[PDB]
Amino acid sequence: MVDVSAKAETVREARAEAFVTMRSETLAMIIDGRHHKGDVFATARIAGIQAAKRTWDLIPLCHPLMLSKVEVNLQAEPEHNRVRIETLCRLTGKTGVEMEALTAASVAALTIYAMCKAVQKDMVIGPVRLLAKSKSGDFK
Amino acid sequence: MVDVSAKAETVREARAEAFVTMRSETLAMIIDGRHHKGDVFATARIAGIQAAKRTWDLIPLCHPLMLSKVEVNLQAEPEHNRVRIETLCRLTGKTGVEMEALTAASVAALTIYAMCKAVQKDMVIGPVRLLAKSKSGDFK
Amino acid sequence: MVDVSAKAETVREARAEAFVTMRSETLAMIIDGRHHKGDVFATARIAGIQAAKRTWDLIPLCHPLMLSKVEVNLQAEPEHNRVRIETLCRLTGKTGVEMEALTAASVAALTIYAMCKAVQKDMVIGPVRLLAKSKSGDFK
Amino acid sequence: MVDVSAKAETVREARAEAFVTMRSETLAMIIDGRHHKGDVFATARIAGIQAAKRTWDLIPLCHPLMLSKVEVNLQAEPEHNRVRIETLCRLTGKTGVEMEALTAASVAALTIYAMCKAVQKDMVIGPVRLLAKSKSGDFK
Amino acid sequence: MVDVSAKAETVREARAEAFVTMRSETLAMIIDGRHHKGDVFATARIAGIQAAKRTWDLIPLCHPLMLSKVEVNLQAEPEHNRVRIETLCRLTGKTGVEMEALTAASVAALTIYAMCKAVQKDMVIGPVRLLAKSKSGDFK
Amino acid sequence: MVDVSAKAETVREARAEAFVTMRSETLAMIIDGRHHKGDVFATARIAGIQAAKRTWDLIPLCHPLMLSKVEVNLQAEPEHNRVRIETLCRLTGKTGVEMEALTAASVAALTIYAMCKAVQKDMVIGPVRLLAKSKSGDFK
Incomplete structure (x- = not known):
């Protein structure tokens, strides 16, 4: 790992996104789902x-x-x-x-x-990528 | 979590795959790369x-x-x-x-x-999915 | 730690209980609460x-x-x-x-x-105790 | 979790207490106990x-x-x-x-x-509560 | 890591030893030491x-x-x-x-x-080696 | 553990060394070894x-x-x-x-x-000791 003691101190931030693709009936169970007992989203x-x-x-x-x-x-x-x-x-x-x-x-x-x-x-995960990060200033 | 003490004992197995997409020059560094000092693949x-x-x-x-x-x-x-x-x-x-x-x-x-x-x-990760799992017998 | 390789193999089980005591308004927020956004019980x-x-x-x-x-x-x-x-x-x-x-x-x-x-x-936690455990057979 | 980057920097402190209730003979073993081989208090x-x-x-x-x-x-x-x-x-x-x-x-x-x-x-644990925390200034 | 599902089931065991070398006064503090407050050996x-x-x-x-x-x-x-x-x-x-x-x-x-x-x-640690392990039967 | 909030803020550093002693054939495998498949040094x-x-x-x-x-x-x-x-x-x-x-x-x-x-x-590990640490200034 590279030394980090030199350049330092600022408000750093990043946003990422991920997707899970599935069948409609599978997605229907999750949604119906929420606000109940073992909420998949909450877990x-x-x-x-x-x-x-x-x-x-x-x-x-x-x-x-x-x-x-x-x-x-x-x-x-x-x-x-x-x-x-x-x-x-x-x-x-x-x-x-x-x-x-x-x-x-x-x-x-x-x-x-x-x-x-x-x-x-056969559910698929992807893509998994960054959206933003802040001398970088990466947005959108 | 569901109880698992009932059905039990067998040789279980699974195979998964993932992809990282990148530029050619980025991939060139990784490859050139291997068998050297901080081999990305080994890490x-x-x-x-x-x-x-x-x-x-x-x-x-x-x-x-x-x-x-x-x-x-x-x-x-x-x-x-x-x-x-x-x-x-x-x-x-x-x-x-x-x-x-x-x-x-x-x-x-x-x-x-x-x-x-x-x-x-802007490298992208995906997809991330299963290939096989063994009364299931999931292959290909 | 005591060796455990001798006596072995059975269905072991235990049940425990804990209590958090608080004000009525505090308990009112939790209840109103559930099935929403940051459900305290789910966490x-x-x-x-x-x-x-x-x-x-x-x-x-x-x-x-x-x-x-x-x-x-x-x-x-x-x-x-x-x-x-x-x-x-x-x-x-x-x-x-x-x-x-x-x-x-x-x-x-x-x-x-x-x-x-x-x-x-000033919320208080307690008591924290066992209820059952199974040659022991501890119930109630 | 709530953001904490805004209000910051000070000497924070807290003191808590817990109790384990047991039989006299059980407490006698612990005490007799200490400064020996597998000191319960030290562990x-x-x-x-x-x-x-x-x-x-x-x-x-x-x-x-x-x-x-x-x-x-x-x-x-x-x-x-x-x-x-x-x-x-x-x-x-x-x-x-x-x-x-x-x-x-x-x-x-x-x-x-x-x-x-x-x-x-049948040993019981409790209560478990705070005693102090330091714009708060919580003492006793 | 090599597969281990084939050859299996037995009582496995091993004994190891380590040494810390130090000055006499340093060793004197540890010994005097034990059975007190922050027993180095117990920790x-x-x-x-x-x-x-x-x-x-x-x-x-x-x-x-x-x-x-x-x-x-x-x-x-x-x-x-x-x-x-x-x-x-x-x-x-x-x-x-x-x-x-x-x-x-x-x-x-x-x-x-x-x-x-x-x-x-300038305390030195070593050597650190095995003493026994049990088709192997490694003793002394 | 001793409080550390008092004396603080500086560039701290330390260097340590360890040795593993073995047979020549054992060392020959490791060396021949590197830059291949399961490089022992990289792991x-x-x-x-x-x-x-x-x-x-x-x-x-x-x-x-x-x-x-x-x-x-x-x-x-x-x-x-x-x-x-x-x-x-x-x-x-x-x-x-x-x-x-x-x-x-x-x-x-x-x-x-x-x-x-x-x-x-019968490979032996040792010694394991410090080389430097920086009001201390420990070198060589």
Whole structure:
């Protein structure tokens, strides 16, 4: 891992997104679903937040850090037969938080899949990519 | 999590795959790359194996288990501008290993991305899906 | 830790309970609450399940094990100004699961407290005790 | 979890307490006990200190942080048939340490229980509450 | 990691040893020391037991497993100016426990060092080696 | 653990070293070895870096911290029949990084041993000691 003690101190931020594609009946169960007993979206939200706080433990050369805010948003899209996962991570440090946002969106997607495993076996996860990161200024 | 003490004991197995898409110059650095100093493929292999052994800690309702074998294979495909990650997990128990194989392929893909972060910012991960799992007998 | 390789193999089980006492207005927010956005009960359920799977990592002389089933049930009791947390853990092994059930009820109670921290500062947790465990046969 | 990058920088502190109630003979073994071979108090002290450093990993929406000081004090009270656990946590940051102090007292109490499991099965843990926290200034 | 599902089931065992060398005054403090407040030997014993249970998480290609018994023994040797750490690990499985015993002796040695850091800076750890392991039958 | 909020803020650094002694044929396999498929040195490097980031989780009274740079260097020495492991850790904080450097060198040494287990059973690890640390100014 590269030294980070030199350039430092600013408000760093990143937003990532992930998708889980599935059948309509599978998506119907999730939606009907929410606000009940074992809400798939709520479980996935929690897992995503725990995952981002463990990013340095999963990616060998990532640097440990204090996240100040982590947000995992889920949205069902019946029109395209899939779930959209949007994440946001923020902190104040020397290094950015792009791996933390991607990691939360990936483990959220993996949790959705885990909970729908018994119904549909051919669900696909992807794509998983960044949306923004702030001398970089990456937006849209 | 659902009880698993009833149906049990057999050779369970699963294979998963993941893709990281990038520019040609980015892929050129990785390849040239290997067998040198900070081999991106070697790092990613290791991370993937550690990730699969932590699957129960990341996915809230997964069950803890003894993996007997975990294999993470990487292959560069200059033709399609991307890396192919193929994983394989095996054990002998009551539950299957589909989440362990998907988790190893996802964290391997995340490690490739982490190490190429400074060069290309718009790399895409996906798709991430299963290939096989064995009363199920899921092949191809 | 005492050796466990001798006496072994059976269906072990335990049930534990915990209580969080608070003001009526505090309990009113939780209840109104559920099935919405950041459901306190759902968060606490998840944390409790993750905690039980990490029991050997928190209690120095506990033995690692494969839990087959973990259940965290929450119930609001406006009559006594508090939340009742009931847990259940099961497995098939040489050792019992009393520490796993107590640990899930304690971290569930701690999560309820964490999420209500800003409102009421004098909330009390307790008691935390066992209800059953099965040559022991401990019931009621 | 709520953003913490705004209000920040001060000496934060909290003190928590926990109780384990048991039979006189059970308490007699612990006391007689100490300064010997497998000192129950020493084990519990250690576990409590490790638990507080893992608080963000157990409570889903807690924020990671650098504790500067963690103290777990145990005191046997034959008069009331129980052990008193008193904890203290300190750091310098944006967020307080109330969950870290409560978590150390709870896992210390759980370790005392674990080690006395074979003797008495009806030991009770509780109450578990805060004593102080420092614009808050919560004392006594 | 190599597959282990084939050859399996037996009582596996291993014993390891480690040494910390130091000045006489440093060793005098440790000894005088024990059975008091922050017993260096007791802390080191605990850490060693937690380390062995995390061996699969530290050594990338080790296999997860259920240890049934872990023992960390410390003995002060004023004659040679050092501490002797002896460990023992046991289980019933397909794989041996040589890495678990070496890992517990190494982290015990590291804990002794940590606690004596402020006094002597040139303490040396070593050697760290195996003593026995049981178709192998390695003794003495 | 001792409070660290008082004296603070500087560039802290430490370098540690470890040795694994083995037969010539064993060392020959490792060397021939590198830049191939399951490079022993690469695996050991990775493990060492993950270990240093977990030091506070293994040594009970160590303080959590943000490492800014961790370096694990391996060098084969056929002349003395062994591997030399040299580590370097850096950060900017109140506490030093001597335990982080020793911990990375110890787990790197343990990984080398793990991977050569099947060939030679009497390999020895040691010594494990510090080389430098910076009001201290410890060099050579």
